[PDB]
Amino acid sequence: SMPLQPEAQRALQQLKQKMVNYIQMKLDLERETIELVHTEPTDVAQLPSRVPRDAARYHFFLYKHTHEGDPLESVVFIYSMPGYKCSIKERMLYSSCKSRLLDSVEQDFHLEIAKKIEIGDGAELTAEFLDDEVH
Template sequence: MTFRIYIICFCVQVQTEVSVDTKHQTLQGVAFPIAKEALQALEKLKNKQLNYVQLQIDIKNETIVLASTLPTELKDLPKRIPKDSARYHFFLYKHSHEGDHLESIVFIYSMPGYMCSIRERMLYSSCKSPLLEIVERQLWMQIIRKIEIGDGDELTPEFLYEEVHPKQHAHKQSFAKPKGPAGKRGIRRLIRGPAETETPTD
């Protein structure tokens, strides 16, 4: 009985390794080949000839292919996110910040949770880092922000702006006003209890 259990476990392990062992496996993930059309679209995006590129994994052929290059404004971005499959999105985010007009490339990894199969979730997650490494180091594309979402409705103008320009002092503000020394500004000590209202100070 023990021998049979060992054989079953061994077979499952081998099948898993074969399904994951693809064209090129790295410590960071699995590097699938990127189709020529996808690379050309990314080059055009880098040169601002396109403002949106969507990539998908051809699971059968173990390749990253081009899915869409539709011209996309910020208001259209949520519509580009599939609700039943994962995707990689590169978006040229045009906006103003502190009086400056900026055009920043944002990477969005959309994964609609359990609407996808386990294999699809595993492959998209494993291929993400190698894909970004190729885009940043070989295509020399500067990605200002990498975002992961589950639903396109999350991509509101406010959300994207705060992701690209996070409020660095948001947490510090809650600690910015320490309590004054005891015996001063006594009028604020009224909230601590009636006993402390006897000796208010100027």
């Protein structure tokens, strides 16, 4: 595959220049494309609020942190799947496109992903969790 809508493409271009720090994407199942939801400014503390309870989402997050006195800004990919609230078709479609989306982001948009994470609940996305996953 499903191609990125141009707005989604532009969001990735911005993320690469660190002009945004957060991107939310979803599948547009009518056109079979990847659609930008938003790129609202998001600190680590607000990150859990970006994860819907009722629909699967893709997220890219610029995690600005320090690893052993060396400050870093790492792009974290998060696939969120609230199993209790998504249909088996939705789960399957988001899982299947996940691999394809990441191929394009790395291969066609030249974005370095420090870590790929799968969650079911935004509440999992603490600073402690992000630290442990990235490092």
